[model samples]
Target: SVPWFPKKISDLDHCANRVLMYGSELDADHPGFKDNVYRKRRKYFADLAMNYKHGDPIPKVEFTEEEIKTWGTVFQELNKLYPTHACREYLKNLPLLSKYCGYREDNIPQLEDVSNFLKERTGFSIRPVAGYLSPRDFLSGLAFRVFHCTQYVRHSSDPFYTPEPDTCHELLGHVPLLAEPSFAQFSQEIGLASLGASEEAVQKLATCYFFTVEFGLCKQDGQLRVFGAGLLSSISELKHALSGHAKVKPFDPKITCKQECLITTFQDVYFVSESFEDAKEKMREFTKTIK
Candidate 1:
């Protein structure tokens, strides 16, 4: 304290020269900077990259009126166009599980109950989870009748292509199938087998996730329709997956579990389920070797 001293020559030089010089220059050009074409161009590109108009604060789970309306509309529409009897049964049971889960008040069917029913009938449950989970966590959860779920919900504008998981992606895309005993059991076995698997093994599991959980298609009466939530929540991908442009292959657990996946884009391929029982049988066979 006896004498003021510079911390370092470079620090003093930076403050005196660069900071002060830039500060003065910025002040002098403030109005021009705001009006400049370069600045405007920068702002335009930034907005485009950020998709500024699509920005919305992440939601914290209070059911909004808008969300209720949107879900209601979706549910009604889905009930109408879905062609399969099994798919219809799954849809019919959703409200029951939704009510049981305490997320809604409508006395709808409960998925946990449906899960229990499926367990009794086949052996599976609708397991819930925290967030983006590792492959090991997924496998462990599957071993115990748990299914990891992404708990977030996308904003209305960015509904089709959110970088994060949301409730809509989880509930709307998944819970319906909890009603199918075979599908439920198969899903659980897949989860269990993947737990503690090697990186190579887990990569196979990711392929399974990609083709089944993320972008699966089901064949009903010779027509392919979207079955995966990753596709269900995505308008563009849903259309693509159902259209002639995308490749759809029969569900083979071995091929699915060993295939590599494209992590950053919409899927180019899908797995086809002949029937839920067939899927369950394959999973049961696969788990015997791993577990």
Candidate 2:
């Protein structure tokens, strides 16, 4: 249950969450809760979080050798796939990450650095959270174009994979897309729509988000390319999804909302959008149904 994500403006209250899951406090899935070193890292992030405010200075965290190694391993591998597997929007903004966010193959970039990068690119910013956050708290942040990010990295032993959405997943998977203007706008719409949506409506919104933002695909050059963060981060799922192993379909807000995507397993079905603009047009129309 990785917590803290996607929120902003007009009050994130009055909404219900469906797809987003929260990790329990001190649960085995919540990294750094048990390990002494990881606990220190979490403590540093939590202590700095007291100062978290919209548009405020981003707090910084120092990475240990092991921590840097974990980040490096992932960076080293994924950097290769992103250029080929990622969509044009993602590829366009990808280089900017390393240029502006202190992104590198040897060390983890602090949220502050990346937030600064995002602020310039698309008015987006990241906030550090202790653990899992409620649907309202998480999605509401997106309304303001603010992301509630968790600073903890997954256990170092398994750098290539982690069951939970750790810092590696959040940073590598979600952050780059935030720099794309259209994608950023799409994310903000989901946040804006969620501010006062009913639980069922919010569920619909989350489903739309899941298929598009998390695991969505789109056309570029009359061929399929990956745009979803879920696909961007996972080497295995990314390869499998494009390799004809998963069932994928065109995106329809109404149709997507009805299905439950299992987080623990590879998704059986995915939604493909004709384009980002199509996704926005259709998704925005769908949000109108929520009162």
Candidate 3:
């Protein structure tokens, strides 16, 4: 009955639709909205995702100086926070990314290189995407250990904040953890449970994914640390997560799946697992109940 859902990895190319949240234009409030040069650059990358095929290699992007500068600004700041704020898996794999994928302050690494690096390590690979993907489409890729990543840079202004998943967000926040084994398994479990799931189940699973993967937290040496991509990527949000301003809850998939979250600003609450293995065990048990 769910012929629209992909049954395997290669089918993703056919199912992957270029659904730009802002249509063919940028949003009025978007930082890049008034910059025609940035707008044009985004369109160029968007078109690349539109034409890509499953087996074809990811296209290489020659980042501009301003784009590299923006990356440099964000990278340097986040690196400083890692020793104190990021989870162990994230901290361990980031330097590996810097070593293998050219992840550094000045260089904008190519998805092809990063994809290959992940494939070798965890059977995870990256595929270029035009814009934001719906939760169903996005989560389904994880079923095959595929990560759909965008290739554009965030607007040069305010390198600290990005309205969408620019290369900086994808490379800095999501990709490093994907290289981790336990995290990789946990990610795939969410994807497998989503295949042909009911509308209600999909929404719940997406919410769970949001809480755990995008904005989740964990404990290290009796201190709260961040593993969620949203927290790992934004300094301001990361601060709010570690400070007394936000509510921190013990992570329970049942409770978290029903938890409400606001993406337009800093999260009002966050959930921390005891550890990655603990989170993985809990997620594995929870996923079986989804269908």
Against the reference, the lDDT scores of all candidates come to: 0.51, 0.75, 0.86
| TM-score of model 2 vs. true structure | 0.87
Of 1 and 2, the candidate ranking higher by TM-score: 2
State TM-scores per candidate. 0.61, 0.87, 0.95
Q: Which lDDT value does model 3 have at 101?
A: 86
Q: Tell me, what's the RMSD of every candidate?
A: 16.0, 4.6, 1.5
Mind giving the per-residue lDDT tens digits that candidate 3 earns over 8-123?
Answer: 89989876773646223677788888888888888898889888889999988788999899999999998898888898889899989889888878799999999999999999
Q: Model 2 over residues 1-291: C-alpha lDDT tens digits?
A: 233333333232222122133332345654455678666655665556544554566667677888889888888888888777888888887788778777787878888888888888899888766555556566777888877777777777667765566678778889988988888898988887877677776677877888898899898888788888877778888877777777888898888888787776788887889888889999878887764
Off by over 4 Å in 3: 1-3, 18-24
> Distance (Å) between predicted and true CA of 73, model 3?
0.3
Cα TM-score of candidate 1: 0.61
If both were scored by lDDT, which would come out higher, candidate 1 or candidate 3? Answer: 3
Model 3: per-residue Cα lDDT at residue 252: 88
**Which candidate has the top score in lDDT?**
3
